Ligand binder design. Sequence first.
Ligand SMILES: Nc1ncnc2c1ncn2[C@@H]1O[C@H](COP(=O)(O)OP(=O)(O)OP(=O)(O)O)[C@@H](O)[C@H]1O
Ligand SMILES: Nc1ncnc2c1ncn2[C@@H]1O[C@H](COP(=O)(O)OP(=O)(O)O)[C@@H](O)[C@H]1O
Ligand SMILES: [Mg+2]
Ligand SMILES: [Mg+2]
Length: 1397
Amino acid sequence: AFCGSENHSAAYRVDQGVLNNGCFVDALNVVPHVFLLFITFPILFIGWGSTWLHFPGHNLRWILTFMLLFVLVCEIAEGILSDGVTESHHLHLYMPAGMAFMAAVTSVVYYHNIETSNFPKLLIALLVYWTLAFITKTIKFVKFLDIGFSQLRFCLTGLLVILYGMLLLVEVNVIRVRRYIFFKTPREVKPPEDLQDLGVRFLQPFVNLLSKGTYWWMNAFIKTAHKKPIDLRAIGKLPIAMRALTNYQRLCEAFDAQVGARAIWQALSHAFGRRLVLSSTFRILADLLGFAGPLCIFGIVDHLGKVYFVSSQEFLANAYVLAVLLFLALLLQRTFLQASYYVAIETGINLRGAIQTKIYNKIMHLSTSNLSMGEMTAGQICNLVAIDTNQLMWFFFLCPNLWAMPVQIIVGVILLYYILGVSALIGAAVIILLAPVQYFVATKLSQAQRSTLEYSNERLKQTNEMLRGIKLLKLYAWENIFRTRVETTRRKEMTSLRAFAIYTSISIFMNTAIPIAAVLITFVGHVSFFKEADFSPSVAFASLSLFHILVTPLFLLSSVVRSTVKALVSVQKLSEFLSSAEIRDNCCVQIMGGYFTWTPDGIPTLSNITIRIPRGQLTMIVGQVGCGKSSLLLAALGEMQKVSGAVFWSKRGPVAYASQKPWLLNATVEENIIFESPFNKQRYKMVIEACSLQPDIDILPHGDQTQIGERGINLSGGQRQRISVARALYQHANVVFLDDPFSALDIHLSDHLMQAGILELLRDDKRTVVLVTHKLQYLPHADWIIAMKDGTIQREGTLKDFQRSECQLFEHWKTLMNRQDQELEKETVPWRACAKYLSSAGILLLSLLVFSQLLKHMVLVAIDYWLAKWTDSALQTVYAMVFTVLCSLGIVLCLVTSVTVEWTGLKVAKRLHRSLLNRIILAPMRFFETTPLGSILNRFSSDCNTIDQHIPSTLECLSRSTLLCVSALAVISYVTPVFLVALLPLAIVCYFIQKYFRVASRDLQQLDDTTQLPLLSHFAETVEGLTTIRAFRYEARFQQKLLEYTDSNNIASLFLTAANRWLEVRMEYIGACVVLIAAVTSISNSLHRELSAGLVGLGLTYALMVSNYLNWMVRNLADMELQLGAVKRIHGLLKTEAESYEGLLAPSLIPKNWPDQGKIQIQNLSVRYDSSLKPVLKHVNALIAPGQKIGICGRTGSGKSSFSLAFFRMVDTFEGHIIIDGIDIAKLPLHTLRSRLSIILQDPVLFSGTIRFNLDPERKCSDSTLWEALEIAQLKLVVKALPGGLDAIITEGGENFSQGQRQLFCLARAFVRKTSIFIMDEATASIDMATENILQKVVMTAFADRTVVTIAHRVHTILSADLVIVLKRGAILEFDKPEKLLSRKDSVFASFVRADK
Ligand SMILES: Nc1ncnc2c1ncn2[C@@H]1O[C@H](COP(=O)(O)OP(=O)(O)OP(=O)(O)O)[C@@H](O)[C@H]1O
Ligand SMILES: Nc1ncnc2c1ncn2[C@@H]1O[C@H](COP(=O)(O)OP(=O)(O)O)[C@@H](O)[C@H]1O
Ligand SMILES: [Mg+2]
Ligand SMILES: [Mg+2]
């Protein structure tokens, strides 16, 4: 009944005034709301009962609408509470506020449906609705001036006046800007820069404020992952402010706006400063809203111990009112927290997208003398993209936590002083004792985290250069030596990881033990000294919850201080890399007087080279090894540092460079032959037909579209060089720089690539060809022969200019191809990985881990179940004598948990890298050939980085959070068992989100992985072929190709971020509902039944614990499920094969001098590479004398290298005997066989280190035998002219020297062994003819008694052999003396030596 039912004839009657009545204004302020409702719901019926742009004042109108909803929800509560004093139900108290609550939601729904459709004239209803109701609240505010500031409804209607007037001022802030009524200029603003037309599906900035906090736009994206899975071009593009190009520009303006390692920090606080400020303000607001939970736990438990308006003191002294106020505080704190998290993470993603483009822009100007001679490697650069940029991004996720922790500590100490008293100071300085100690171990971490990222980096050198040369380590039996070399660095890294793990264990122990020591010294330091300071369950379970909420930042301070040390050395390495070295009449190039140098401080490698290159004519650069050929090619491009002289051109213009070491993309065969050029089919066919690449293309599995490169099918040695040559013949570049292309090709391919190609594709089409070559038989075909000697050019000009003026190098050319009886002239033309993590820990450590974390939280509950038996006894010192022995059992059961977590996380990571390193070495070469090296290196680089450094923290956070959430649901179901009835229809709802989330999580997790991999692959392939890219002038195109990758990675990271925040805000809303339920069923159980009021505070404290640690349990469970995939991949690699190193023969029967007379008898041998392939050799029979010098010649693909590898059992021999010295070769251990036979591969496989290390990694032979085995490799004068002499530094891959001196260094490496069987698999390929003719005469005199099997590149060097093998497609075609083979004149050997004269 309205206006009461007591029948006093005073509220129904209006005599002295119809407006002066105490009632009837409650009857008057409803018809504005029913006016709005009954004219708004027709518009919802006729308009919406069947490229969006926000109106201005959007965030202010939504914030004022939420404040209006909160004040109306308080006014309904004031009406219901003020009715309870009366005898009956006075309807005029709760109905006029309830109708306004029903109409305000309708008003904000109406405003959103108007703004999303751009119907601004339809706001005229909202023009008037915020006037008259405001007017109807104004009279109700001024007729209440009879009751001021001591009655609650006075302040409530004053707030209603202020909110309605503010909404009216925002409403008139729409007509005056987007004019719809009473104006002549309808200033229609544009849609948001057409960001809905470009195909952006992110929609997070272009959403209303309710969908920005609850991520409601994401709720449609989870529902459509169940039907069709999420792919790229379904998450759309990026918005115009989150692109890497526009995030890179604001990084550059910050760098230019200030003209070191602090310049980046001032450049990151200027570009991305206000966004971190905004996220820190969201974190601060969530902190201040978190400091209203314990105030409600104070007020509720303080209530349980003890004119129709209700005073404002007796409103905040109610219990259900404080419960719903705590619920509405948690509901807004939990969304301010996610609003902080999203802004911080999107700022980190924009930072990553900016600094990756800055690193690439440094790469495109990077001098290659940094990579080659000295400082950095390619793996170091791809590490500072993959690891260092990710660490700097992960710092930006926690920088608002670092900025908003001390304000939480300060407000907690002030509120603790207000609640408990000066005894809070007893619990304050102890927390202040946590301030330098968490700094102190920080300094210790700044040692250890600066050491591990040193040592592991060196390990990622020594692993990688092992794997990329693993075949040579499996051919010299050096694999155990290199495995011990990596194990030493791994041991020195595990020492630093122990020193880091001990200090982060004591940091975790400090962060978890300083709160409980504070609780102990505060609660016993209260009842001992100040026994009259009002000890009560209210103040006890308020200050205990404040101590708990001062331990929620300490849940993350250890991870914050762990992550801010890895991001200072990150920006230190980034500043070290960004300020490194950089580059700056019918003739193409006309160098004159130019001294060029590789090292900036040293002798110039080229000296006074005054050359000229004719246009459209083939010019040849010939000379010895180390003579300046590739350096002269790289001085015209500008890669070498110019000291003096001039370099003219035609700016340069693009050339077609094909380097001495071929460089392949991670793309198909077609896509790195055309190389970002227009595809012309006829020119492509003429290119691959002149290169004779078509029969090698047909054997490939997909033909023209098979993914070759590093992360794909491993090609041969000549196929990749022919592809890299074929790239250069497809450019219209008009000047071709063909560095030595005949290294891996044989005679029949080289004579076809020289006739068609260099003489027919580039001499018909008048393109300048500059051909570095060692094949002097093509010296007739040149128009300008350049001849170098020790860097300086010796002579240039035609063959007439060389036979008339030089006449000594000319005769030296003529006696090199034995053409003395001729003339040189120009031609007139859970999972199992979790058990693997738990079985590699050991049962003694695992039972000490499980049964000491269930024992800590069974103690921590008894620490909080006591003080509920104590403070109920406060309404006597034996309660405090057993509280110290429980608080000391929460420290000594904390230290053991924090040490066994890190002990487990270290003992697993030691056991999981040694067991992987010992198994990768034992794997057969077929495993290294098929599977890409990028995967095997990523299991050593990233997964062995997340196992030791991320899982022992994630496991600790997961175990602590899930045990707090389990032990917190077991005591709010003990004090209120009715909560169990309310647990079942909600907790399974948690399951019914998580399953419903997971098919959109595990989908979107696989776009943050399969889009980061091409980004890292592009960063790896832009460094290996940097000189090739900068010579084609494809720097801008490759920068655009970077931007198109990092944008697609950034959008896939942003969608995963938004999905995570969607799930987390839903889980925290369920947690807030848990707090509301467990507060209501504790209050209503203590007011009716007798819950003794301490159990109510206990249940309230642990309900707040559920709200805090439900989301951390969910997040750490998802993070453990993500990080266990690394253990799964390592366990996948750990179950690989073995090469069967044991032999069928006991080592007592193999003599000490095993191949004492190399007497290799081969009978019916046939090899294969894998059991599904054709036999490479077939029925080969050969008998070799104990001192013969057999040579092997044949075409490419005949099986020459398979014959060479058949002695070392690197090919699957399935039929046939190889018997040496009467002892079979299959019944032999592999480390006995391979360490007593030598082989020189065609490719140089030099490792980084020193000359003495590369010649022998064991340091077993003397120093003088490293010189006799260097004098015969034609390198004594080169090594003796080095600064170090011996022990001079060879850098990674051997790039410090040439590709001729590299092959000479591998030849000298094989000559230090005193074995009696030698195999030379085309060793003299990169070496010139003069040095080869010297080297053969020194080798076949010093090794005058050793059996040498020489796979001959140029078959004119093999005529001095005793016997000659001619392979032709498998089986041996000819096997006789070379004179008897040449006497036939129709034999294949006489055919082979005919094409080389
Ligand atoms: N990338 C490099 N960084 C530093 N020094 C180099 C590099 N390349 C070569 N050198 C030095 O410069 C000298 C000239 O080598 P160059 O670059 O001319 O190779 P090259 O002689 O053309 O190769 P080849 O022996 O196949 O002809 C060598 O003695 C070597 O020590
Ligand atoms: N690692 C490998 N895996 C599979 N097949 C191979 C491998 N190496 C060589 N082959 C095959 O063996 C044949 C001859 O190989 P090889 O002896 O290396 O060539 P060449 O005699 O020209 O040096 C080739 O046709 C090639 O297809
Ligand atoms: Mg060279
Ligand atoms: Mg070969």
